[PDB]
Amino acid sequence: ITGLVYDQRMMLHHNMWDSHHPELPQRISRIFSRHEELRLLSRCHRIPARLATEEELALCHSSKHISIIKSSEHMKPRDLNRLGDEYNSIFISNESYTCALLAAGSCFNSAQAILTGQVRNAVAIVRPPGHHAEKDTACGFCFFNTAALTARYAQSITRESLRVLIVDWDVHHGNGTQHIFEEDDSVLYISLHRYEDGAFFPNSEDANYDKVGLGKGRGYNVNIPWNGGKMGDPEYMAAFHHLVMPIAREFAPELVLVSAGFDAARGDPLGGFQVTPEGYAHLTHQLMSLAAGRVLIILEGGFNLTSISESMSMCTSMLLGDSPPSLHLTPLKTSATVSINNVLRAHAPFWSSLR
Numbered sequence: 249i250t251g252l253v254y255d256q257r258m259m260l261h262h263n264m265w266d267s268h269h270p271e272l273p274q275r276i277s278r279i280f281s282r283h284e285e286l287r288l289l290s291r292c293h294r295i296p297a298r299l300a301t302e303e304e305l306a307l308c309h310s311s312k313h314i315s316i317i318k319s320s321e322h323m324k325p326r327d328l329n330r331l332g333d334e335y336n337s338i339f340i341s342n343e344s345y346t347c348a349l350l351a352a353g354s355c356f357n358s359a360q361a362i363l364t365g366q367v368r369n370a371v372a373i374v375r376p377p378g379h380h381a382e383k384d385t386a387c388g389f390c391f392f393n394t395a396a397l398t399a400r401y402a403q404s405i406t407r408e409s410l411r412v413l414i415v416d417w418d419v420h421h422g423n424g425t426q427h428i429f430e431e432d433d434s435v436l437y438i439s440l441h442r443y444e445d446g447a448f449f450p451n452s453e454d455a456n457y458d459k460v461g462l463g464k465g466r467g468y469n470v471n472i473p474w475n476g477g478k479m480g481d482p483e484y485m486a487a488f489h490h491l492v493m494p495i496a497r498e499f500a501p502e503l504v505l506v507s508a509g510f511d512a513a514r515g516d517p518l519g520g521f522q523v524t525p526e527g528y529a530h531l532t533h534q535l536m537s538l539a540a541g542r543v544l545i546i547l548e549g550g551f552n553l554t555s556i557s558e559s560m561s562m563c564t565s566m567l568l569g570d571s572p573p574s575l576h577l578t579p580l581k582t583s584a585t586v587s588i589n590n591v592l593r594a595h596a597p598f599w600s601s602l603r
């Protein structure tokens with residue numbers, strides 16, 4: 249069966265200076281409501297949220313970073329503003345730390361539910377997001393790297409070398425996730441993201457296809473960067489067909505984590521892409537063929553409330569075993585073919601399935 253975790257307390261994190269900032273509290277309540285409306289909620293096993301512990305945060309983050317974000321709990325508005333401004337694209341309220349702990353702890357409980365056999369797969373409707381967060385810093389609406397921490401947490405209750413695949417289909421590069429595992433061959437990081445040769449957030453060449461990992465982790469970092477404007481279902485289905493799925497099958501993960509931002513969705517003001525809810529359903533359904541179905545979908549970005557609610561609900565529908573909706577309709581944009589070919593050339597030395 250399918251687990252679901254959601255806790256309205258994660259809505260308390262808010263922007264006190266700009267109440268229309270796109271990373272809204274109602275992102276998670278709208279997704280939760282849509283699950284209820286589509287009668288998906290009643291079909292799931294409800295997994296309780298919990299706080300991550302500071303020891304658990306230290307799986308990926310420095311004690312300094314943990315301490316600094318923790319300290320924000322007690323700050324007056326002026327110092328919250330000052331601290332937030334020390335990072336790239338961060339706002340902080342007194343509730344932020346607690347919400348970031350709940351987001352992480354919720355995902356640990358979800359991974360635990362899967363790994364103990366209580367559920368086969370699970371969805372986590374959480375905020376604030378995580379994948380921009382680095383070992384030592386907050387970034388891009390993210391405080392702690394929830395997905396990265398969850399991979400380590402999974403390893404901490406099974407085997408240090410448990411093979412974890414992280415598929416990051418948030419429209420942005422998960423810079424923090426890449427860096428945390430860059431020298432690691434136990435965690436395969438595969439990200440699809442708008443890149444625009446560095447013009448798209450977070451604006452680093454770290455996100456390019458030629459960054460394939462370091463040391464023993466060489467080959468275990470797969471960046472699929474998009475250039476030249478809007479991409480959609482055809483391009484994402486093709487990237488999964490040619491790259492994500494062949495590499496994933498060869499890696500043979502024992503657990504799949506999805507950094508599931510829905511900002512590549514049709515309608516997203518930040519992403520500018522047009523992946524459909526049906527498209528996200530097919531991506532989910534493909535990932536379910538891995539790791540004996542052990543997949544945990546973790547909300548990252550995604551800022552059109554209707555788009556993210558429809559899209560994530562479709563993912564949960566697939567997890568629950570529903571038939572994929574009818575769909576990949578068009579030839580690829582030429583720059584997407586170039587992107588896919590660039591990644592294939594970059595990773596053929598490491599994956600026999602690409603040769």
Ligand SMILES: *Nc1ccc2c(C)cc(=O)oc2c1
Nearest residue numbers: 268269270337449516517518
């Ligand atoms: N990084 C960023 C911050 C704020 C935004 C708003 C308010 C709207 C938008 O379309 O994109 C944004 C991107």
Ligand SMILES: [K+]
Nearest residue numbers: 416418420440
């Ligand atoms: K991504």
Ligand SMILES: [K+]
Nearest residue numbers: 429432435468
């Ligand atoms: K890696």
Ligand SMILES: [Zn+2]
Nearest residue numbers: 418420509549
């Ligand atoms: Zn994003």
